[PDB]
Amino acid sequence: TFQMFWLDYCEVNNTLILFGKVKCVSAMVQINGLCRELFFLPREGKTPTDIHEEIIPLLMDKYGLDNIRAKPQKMKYSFELPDIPSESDYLKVLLPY
């Protein structure tokens, strides 16, 4: 396995790059395939499957992606936004960068 000591980073063409030292000489690690984690909060009485039915195809059309990973998941929330309950099932959707 390739071992590096990352200190700093950069962003270009929507990708993340790690700079660091390799046993010691500097190096670069261009990282691809990273994904945004998206959490959809279902409406009262709806299910994460409903969101999967509705917006996953639409995300395929707008982003031109063949398949989008998304799954139901229970996630907690206790922040300043009042309209989101404390504990709910979210549809964690990974939208790749």
Side-chain angles (χ1 to χ4, degrees), residues 1-27 29-42 44-45 47-55 57-61 63-68 70-74 76-78 80-97:
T1 54
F2 177 69
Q3 305 182 287
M4 226 189 54
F5 192 43
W6 83 279
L7 303 170
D8 209 21
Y9 71 96
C10 158
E11 290 188 43
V12 64
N13 300 328
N14 289 337
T15 68
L16 175 59
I17 288 161
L18 297 182
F19 301 105
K21 318 228 75 177
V22 169
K23 324 202 161 193
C24 293
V25 160
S26 64
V29 178
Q30 184 186 245
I31 309 180
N32 315 136
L34 269 156
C35 299
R36 303 223 341 255
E37 71 196 40
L38 282 69
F39 292 90
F40 294 84
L41 181 56
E44 181 182 5
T47 46
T49 306
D50 295 31
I51 306 170
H52 200 308
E53 288 175 355
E54 150 173 88
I55 211 154
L58 297 170
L59 267 42
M60 280 156 217
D61 310 34
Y63 294 104
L65 211 63
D66 288 24
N67 154 67
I68 296 179
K71 84 202 291 283
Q73 172 143 18
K74 194 170 267 294
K76 214 183 181 303
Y77 190 88
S78 61
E80 315 318 305
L81 247 191
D83 52 330
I84 291 99
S86 285
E87 194 173 22
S88 308
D89 291 332
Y90 288 76
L91 182 70
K92 181 181 71 154
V93 179
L94 283 37
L95 191 63
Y97 278 98

